[PDB]
Ligand binder design. Structure first.
Ligand SMILES: [Zn+2]
Length: 104
């Protein structure tokens, strides 16, 4: 079973934990990867009910299970805050333009 489902992509809690670890470490190092410079700030204009406080940061989680290293980020993201707490798993899949919907 999938702990999070983004469109047709399935992720386990281990895939989320691995992606968050890598994105939080670049945050601590003041570094980014990719054309679109991840991790970068996430603003909750859609009003998702995250129970952790901002600032929030978004980082790609890949369907392949590999940690994002630059290259196409795909449509899925883990969102974490400044204290390295998981906020949620969201996706551009099924949302117009640059908006997002939450993974279920
Ligand atoms: Zn996996």
């Amino acid at each position: 079973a999938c702990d999070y489902t983004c469109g047709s992509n399935c992720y386990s809690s281990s895939d989320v934990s691995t992606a968050q670890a890598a994105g939080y470490k670049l945050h601590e190092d003041g570094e980014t990867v990719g054309s679109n410079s991840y991790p970068h700030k996430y603003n909750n204009y859609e009003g998702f009910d995250f129970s952790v406080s901002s600032p929030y940061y978004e980082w790609p989680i890949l369907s392949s299970g590999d940690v994002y290293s630059g290259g196409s980020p795909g449509a899925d993201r883990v969102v974490f805050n400044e204290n390295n707490q998981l906020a949620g798993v969201i996706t551009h899949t099924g949302a117009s333009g640059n908006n997002f919907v939450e993974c279920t």
